[PDB]
């Protein structure tokens, strides 16, 4: 019980965290129904609005006023933000020319630039195109500071998963806020956005910025603002906190706006009604900057203007219903809308048939506006599976559409939540201040990367997260992180000819040019061999009986040759590797469901003599015939197409084992499938990393400057049910599938325990940016 009889006198928006039975005067007091009786009266003053007028200049202090225009307001830190403009003839911050902030210009007592995070809900990246005509303050921040054309949110592109990712540097599957609504089967409880359950600490994993700050002796302002607190009061509170004595003043602050999201949902992203909320957010930014200029902090503070996600045109007319595909939807609970998550209505109800449900949702309407996936089959780039709160059955919804349970379930013209690579879901990033670069444009980057940067801006050591520290050093003038190259754990063996062809009873019948960025380092304890060939180089695992990586270079005008008729089933023993550490063909003859493929393709052999190397047992990998349709098309058509378009390509391909879908390389005990009657593990995925020169006029094998990369993590599946057009020729569907499964080099590194690009002429920070790059095809 909380004693509301107490008073908020001289305690309004106190940073002093007090518990029961003492009444609170902070922002969260309303949500916990613990405010002192006089909180609204004393702390939420509204009298005379939020602006000084000429008639108010030099007034007598009236404590009932929302903000002040009296002579003592500056010394008291409670002037209306436009006080110096209206009463002292100063100019608005927006009307001043920007000047480079080479060093922080801070008043006495500030030893470090404070950080202000200005978060805007549903701020689509494209809204920035409106410019100074609609948003002059935001345009000045963007133009004069450091900005990205867009920032990639996390999936689902919903509010709480994205705001909490921004705060922690973690994927939702790791921080636990997997949706705006979620069901935890262990707690047997539902998290809702409009419930008291969301305040329970058990939902919130990882370590958010305000906790990282507090644990390291750095004071933080609130990261939660009550809906009942107007934006002008939020701004005045931040400014009042910035005016506090040296020993009370926070170093990190957060502002939040429910706009332009609110209006975006009502009118859609391209509605004329979108101008009004954009002008309003700009006015709030103007109040903050004028306020900072008033406190002599406008050239001292680092300001981050950031969004959680974008907004798409979504109407009630564009809704698919599960009742149109499934006989009985009454035994199912659906998390609906721009994504779908399906579970039984009764938590542990045994009448629930997941395989029959997926079958009825798979390619059952010609222009179907969603696709079902078992969570382990979702694109790996989404990192959306390793959490008990993520239902096994998922629906990836097409942009502009909704999924609902039945017709019983327009007032809305906009929505968000779709695949995080979707153009309309991209949001904003602007960094302004002494620590950010001046008038600099940076490439798009992911929001998971920001936590490390915010820790750098505050002199904090970041908690373990999913960002790649140093990948965003190019955004900063100072406070850059010096990254350390991961230490190589296992040393390779370099075997020569050690065995006879007669030593093998496998049932089988028959660096300068190819390793351009150095040997990938193996970052775990294992036994592996480096194998050299005329056309390729490989790192052959003696434990997994296959390469961890196969590396080769294809010139722009290289020839594609066929596999000769008599060499169709040709598999040759490798005299450098023991029969005991080799795969066997009897297993592929026995397994009626499993076939095999090759990592280096025989199609791209340099000569008929060289082609025989591609048929080595050490270049073979287990592949389902359905997957072979995809792999053969990539190997025979796409590798050469990419070489022709990019002026040669360097390709690194290999297997991935992720049976427990945690995005990390499996240990031997985690492998759950092997080739029939053998010890050959079955990969869950196959990766490829395709590098060339950013300057396409230079060939891939003779590149002087920055690199260009595209990568994939292809699901190794026994059917092509994911591709609704798979009955057609591979030219009509395989590339579409590969684009959906695009990946960062960093995603492959986590899944393999490998470290790429260790020997280049580029800085390590530039290589980290390259490794986090995602080719979206958007």
Ligand X SMILES: *[C@@H]1O[C@H](CO)[C@@H](O[C@@H]2O[C@H](CO)[C@@H](O[C@@H]3O[C@H](CO[C@H]4O[C@H](CO)[C@@H](O)[C@H](O[C@H]5O[C@H](CO)[C@@H](O)[C@H](O)[C@@H]5O[C@H]5O[C@H](CO)[C@@H](O)[C@H](O)[C@@H]5O)[C@@H]4O)[C@@H](O)[C@H](O[C@H]4O[C@H](CO)[C@@H](O)[C@H](O)[C@@H]4O)[C@@H]3O)[C@H](O)[C@H]2NC(C)=O)[C@H](O)[C@H]1NC(C)=O
Ligand Y SMILES: *[C@@H]1O[C@H](CO)[C@@H](O[C@@H]2O[C@H](CO)[C@@H](O)[C@H](O)[C@H]2NC(C)=O)[C@H](O)[C@H]1NC(C)=O
The SS3 assignment for 340 reads: strand
- Strand, coil or helix: 681: strand
Report residue 319: phi and psi, to 5°: -125, 125
Residues forming contacts to Na ion in the complex (CB under 5 A) are 720, 726
Burial 723-761 (b: 16+ CB within 10 A, else e): bbebeeebeebbbebbbbbbbbbbbbbbbbbbbbbeebe
Binders of ligand 9V8 in range 86-125 (CB under 6 A)? 117, 119, 121
Token digits of residue 534 = 């005329």
Q: Are 486 and 468 in contact (CB under 8 A)?
A: no
Residues in contact with K ion by CB under 5 A are 588, 595
Asked if residue 256 binds ligand 9V8 (CB under 6 A), the reply is yes
Residues 274-333 touching Ca ion, rule: CB under 5 A, are: 324
159 is in an annotated binding site: yes
Q: Which stretch binds ligand Y (CB under 6 A): 354-362, 381-389, 455-463, 532-540?
A: 354-362
Q: How far apart are CA 204 and CA 136, in angstroms?
A: 37
Of 443-502, which residues contact Ca ion (CB under 5 A)?
Answer: none
Question: Interface with ligand Y includes 422 (CB under 6 A)?
Answer: no
Q: How far apart are CA 31 and CA 41, in angstroms?
A: 17
* Minimum distance of K ion from residue 627's CB (angstroms): 13
Backbone φ/ψ region at 482: left (φ over 0), alpha (ψ -120 to 50), beta: beta
Q: Which of 179, 310, 372, 431 binds Cl ion (CB under 5 A)?
A: 179
**Chosen residue from 664, 670, 678, 739 binding ligand X by CB under 6 A:** 664
Nearest CA among 392, 384, 452 for reference residue 417: 384
Q: Are 128 and 263 in contact, with CB atoms under 8 Å apart?
A: no
Binding residues for ligand 9V8 restricted to 184-213, rule: CB under 6 A: 193, 208
Residue 193's binding partner out of Na ion, ligand 9V8, Cl ion, none, with CB under 5 to 8 Å set by partner kind: ligand 9V8
Residue 337 site contact among Zn ion, ligand X, ligand Y, none (CB < 5 to 8 Å, cut-off depends on kind)? none
d(CA 340, CA 352): 17
Number of residues that bind ligand Y (CB under 6 A): 9
Token pair 């670069």: residue: 437
Contact call for residues 588 and 541 (beta carbons, < 8 A): no
Distance (Å, whole) CA 261 – CA 272:
15
Confirm or deny that 545 is annotated as ligand binding. no
Q: Which is nearer to ligand X, 188 or 565 (CB)?
A: 188
Q: Considering CB distances under 5 to 8 angstroms, the limit depending on partner class, which of Na ion, ligand 9V8, Ca ion, none binds residue 300?
A: none
Site for ligand X in 178-217 (CB under 6 A): 205-206
* 372 token code pair: 């079902």
Torsion of CA 313, 316, 320, 321, to 10 degrees: 150
Q: Is 3 helix (H, G, I), strand (E, B) or coil?
A: strand
The reply, when asked if residue 97 is annotated as ligand binding, is no
Could you tell me the smallest distance in angstroms from the CB atom of residue 105 to ligand 9V8? 25
CA distance 418 to 422: 7
Our CB check for K ion shows the closer of 305 and 624 to be: 624
Decide: is 356 part of the binding site for ligand Y (CB under 6 A). yes
Six token digits for residue 34 = 């613990």
Q: Is 257 exposed, middle or buried (0-12, 13-18, 19+ CB in 10 A)?
A: buried
Q: Is 167 in the site for ligand 9V8 (CB under 6 A)?
A: yes
| Cβ at position 724, least distance to Na ion in Å | 6
584 marked as part of a ligand binding site: no
57-92: burial string, b at 16+ Cβ within 10 Å, e else: eebeeeeebbbbbbeebbeebbbbbbbbbbbeebeb
Question: Which C-beta is closer to ligand 9V8: that of 117 or that of 458?
Answer: 117
The stretch among 79-87, 280-288, 339-347, 663-671 that binds Ca ion (CB under 5 A) is: 663-671
423 is in an annotated binding site: no
Q: By CB under 6 A, is residue 711 in contact with ligand X? A: no
Q: Contact between 434 and Cl ion (CB under 5 A)?
A: no
Q: Is 180 labelled a binding residue?
A: yes
Given 81, 157, 159, 435, the catalytic residue: 159
Q: Tell whether residue 261 is a contact of ligand 9V8 (CB under 6 A).
A: yes
Under rule CB under 6 A, residue 494 binds ligand 9V8 = no
Q: How far is the CB of 329 from ligand Y (least distance, A)?
A: 8
Strand 528-532 and strand 537-541: pairing?
Answer: antiparallel
Of 56 and 375, the one with the shorter C-beta distance to Ca ion is: 375
What mask, x for binding Zn ion by CB under 5 A, covers residues 630 to 669?
A: ----------------------------------------
159 is catalytic: yes
Nearer CB in complex with Zn ion: 121/398: 121
Which of Ca ion, ligand X, ligand Y, none does residue 205 bind to, with CB < 5 to 8 Å depending on kind? ligand X
- Is residue 159 a contact point for Zn ion (CB under 5 A)? yes
Residues in 283-342 at the binding interface with Cl ion, rule: CB under 5 A = none
Helices 764-772 and 745-752, interaxial angle, to 10°?
90
Strand partners, 712: 688, 742
553 annotated to bind ligand: no
- For residue 726, the partner it binds in Zn ion, Cl ion, Na ion, none, with Cβ less than 5 to 8 A by kind, is Na ion
Does the footprint of ligand X cover residue 322 (CB under 6 A)?
no
Query: Is residue 265 a known part of a binding site?
Result: yes
The span from the CA of 600 to the CA of 617, in Å, is: 12
Measured distance CA(605)–CA(616) in Å, rounded: 13
The single-letter DSSP state of residue 662 is S
Residues 271-330 that bind Zn ion (CB under 5 A): 308
In 3D space, the residue among 438, 474, 440, 472 whose CA is nearest the CA of residue 455 turns out to be 472
Residue 214 interaction partner, one of K ion, Cl ion, Ca ion, none, beta carbon < 5-8 Å per kind:
none
Q: Residue 387 has which token pair?
A: 């959490």
670 scored as a contact of ligand Y (CB under 6 A): no
From Cl ion, Ca ion, ligand Y, none, interface partner of 179 (C-beta below 5 to 8 A by class): Cl ion
Angle between helices 136-144 and 275-294 (to 10 degrees): 60
Q: Which stretch binds ligand Y (CB under 6 A): 356-364, 370-378, 582-590, 742-750?
A: 356-364
Report the Cα 157 to chain-centroid distance in Å.
10
| 121 annotated as ligand-binding | yes
d(CA 514, CA 651): 8
The structure tokens listed for 607 are 């000569």
**Shortest spacing between CB 461 and ligand X, in angstroms:** 14
Task: Please report the DSSP string for 286-328 in residue order.
Answer: HHHHHHHHHTT-TTT-EEEEEES---EE--TTSEEEGGGT-S-
CB of 751 closer than 8 Å to CB of 658: yes
C-alpha to C-alpha distance for 273 and 260, rounded to whole angstroms: 11
Q: Annotated binding residue at 74?
A: no
Q: Is 664 annotated as a binding residue?
A: yes
Q: Does 549 bind ligand 9V8 (CB under 6 A)?
A: no
Binding mask 2-41 for ligand Y (x = CB under 6 A): -x-xx-----------------------------------
174: contact with ligand X by CB under 6 A: yes
Q: Which amino acids are annotated as binding site, given as ranges?
A: 121, 159, 180, 261, 265, 308-309, 416, 658, 660, 662, 664, 666
Q: Which amino acids are annotated as binding site for 1-tetradecanoyl-sn-glycerol 3-phosphate, given as ranges?
A: 159, 180, 261, 416
Residues identified as active-site = 159
Q: Which amino acids are annotated as binding site for Ca(2+), given as ranges?
A: 658, 660, 662, 664, 666
Q: Which residues bind ligand X (CB under 6 A)?
A: 170-171, 173-176, 205-206, 383, 386-387, 464-466, 663-664, 750
Q: Which residues bind Cl ion (CB under 5 A)?
A: 158, 179-180
Q: Which residues bind ligand 9V8 (CB under 6 A)?
A: 117, 119, 121, 159, 163-164, 166-167, 180, 193, 208, 223-225, 254, 256, 258, 261
Q: Which amino acids are annotated as binding site for 1-hexadecanoyl-sn-glycero-3-phosphate, given as ranges?
A: 159, 180, 261, 416
């Amino acid at each position: 019980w909380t004693n509301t009889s107490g008073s908020c006198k001289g305690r309004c928006f106190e940073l002093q965290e007090v518990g029961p039975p003492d009444c609170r005067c902070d922002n969260l007091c309303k949500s916990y129904s613990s405010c002192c009786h006089d909180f609204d009266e004393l702390c939420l003053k509204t009298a005379r609005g939020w602006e000084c007028t000429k008639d108010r200049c030099g007034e007598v202090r009236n404590e009932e006023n929302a903000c002040h225009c009296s002579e003592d307001c500056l010394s008291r830190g409670d002037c209306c933000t436009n006080y110096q403009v209206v009463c002292k003839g100063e100019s608005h911050w927006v009307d001043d020319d920007c000047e480079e902030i080479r060093v922080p210009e801070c008043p006495a007592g500030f030893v470090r630039p404070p950080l202000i995070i200005f978060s805007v809900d549903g701020f689509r990246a494209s809204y920035m195109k409106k410019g100074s005509k609609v948003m002059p303050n935001i345009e000045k921040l963007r133009s004069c500071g450091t900005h990205a054309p867009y920032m990639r949110p996390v999936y689902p592109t919903k509010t709480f998963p994205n705001l909490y990712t921004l705060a922690t540097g973690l994927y939702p599957e790791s921080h636990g806020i997997v949706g705006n609504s979620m069901y935890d089967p262990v707690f047997d409880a539902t998290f809702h956005l409009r419930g008291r359950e969301k305040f329970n600490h058990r939902w919130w994993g990882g370590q958010p910025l305000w906790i990282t700050a507090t644990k390291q002796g750095v004071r933080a302002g609130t990261f939660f603002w009550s809906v009942s607190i107007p934006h002008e009061r939020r701004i005045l509170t931040i400014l009042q906190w910035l005016s506090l004595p040296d020993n009370e003043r926070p170093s990190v602050y957060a502002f939040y706006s429910e706009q332009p999201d609110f209006s975006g949902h009502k009118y859609g992203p391209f509605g004329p009604e979108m101008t009004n909320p954009l002008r309003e957010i700009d006015k709030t930014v103007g109040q903050l900057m004028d306020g900072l200029k008033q406190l002599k902090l406008h050239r001292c503070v680092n300001v981050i203007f950031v969004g959680d996600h974008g907004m798409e045109d979504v109407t009630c007319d564009r809704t698919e219903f599960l009742s149109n595909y499934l006989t009985n939807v009454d035994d199912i609970t659906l998390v609906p809308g721009t994504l779908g998550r399906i579970r039984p209505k009764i938590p542990n109800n045994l009448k629930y048939d997941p395989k029959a449900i997926i079958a009825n949702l798979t390619c059952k309407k010609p222009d179907q506006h969603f696709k079902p996936y078992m969570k382990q089959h979702l694109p790996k780039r989404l990192h959306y599976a390793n959490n008990r709160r993520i239902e096994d059955l998922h629906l990836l919804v097409e942009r502009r559409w909704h999924v609902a349970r039945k017709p019983l379930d327009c007032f809305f013209q906009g929505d968000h939540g779709f695949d995080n690579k979707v153009n309309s879901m991209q949001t904003v990033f602007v960094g302004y201040g002494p620590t950010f670069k001046y008038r600099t444009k940076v490439p798009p980057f992911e929001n998971i990367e920001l936590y490390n940067v915010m820790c750098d801006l505050l002199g904090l050591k970041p908690a373990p997260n999913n960002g790649t520290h140093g990948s965003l050093n190019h955004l900063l003038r100072t406070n850059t992180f010096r990254p350390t190259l991961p230490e190589e754990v296992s040393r390779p063996n370099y075997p020569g000819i050690m065995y006879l062809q007669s030593d093998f009873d496998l049932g089988c019948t028959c660096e300068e040019r190819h390793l351009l960025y150095g040997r990938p380092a193996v970052l775990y304890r294992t036994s592996y061999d480096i194998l050299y060939h005329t056309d390729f180089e490989s790192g052959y695992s003696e434990i997994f009986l296959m390469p961890l990586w196969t590396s080769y270079t294809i010139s722009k005008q290289a020839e594609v040759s066929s596999i000769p008729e008599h060499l169709t089933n040709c598999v040759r023993p490798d005299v450098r590797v023991s029969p005991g550490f080799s795969q066997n063909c009897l297993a592929y003859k026995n397994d009626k469901q499993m076939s095999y493929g090759f990592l280096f393709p025989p199609y791209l052999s340099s000569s008929p003599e060289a082609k025989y190397d591609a048929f080595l047992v050490t270049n073979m990998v287990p592949m389902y015939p359905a997957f072979k349709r995809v792999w053969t098309y990539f190997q025979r058509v796409l590798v050469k197409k990419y070489a022709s378009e990019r002026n040669g390509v360097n390709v690194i391909s290999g297997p991935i084992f992720d049976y427990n879908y945690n995005g990390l390389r499996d240990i031997e005990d985690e492998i759950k499938q092997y080739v029939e009657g053998s010890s050959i593990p079955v990969p869950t995925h196959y990766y490829s990393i395709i590098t060339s020169c950013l300057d396409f006029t230079q060939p891939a094998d003779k590149c002087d400057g920055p690199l260009s990369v595209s990568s994939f993590i292809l699901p190794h599946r026994p059917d092509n049910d994911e591709s609704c057009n798979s009955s057609e020729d591979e030219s009509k569907w395989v590339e579409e599938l590969m684009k959906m499964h695009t990946a960062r080099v960093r995603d492959i590194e986590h899944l393999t325990g490998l470290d790429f690009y260790r020997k280049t002429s580029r800085s390590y920070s530039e290589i980290l940016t390259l490794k986090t790059y995602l080719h979206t095809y958007e």
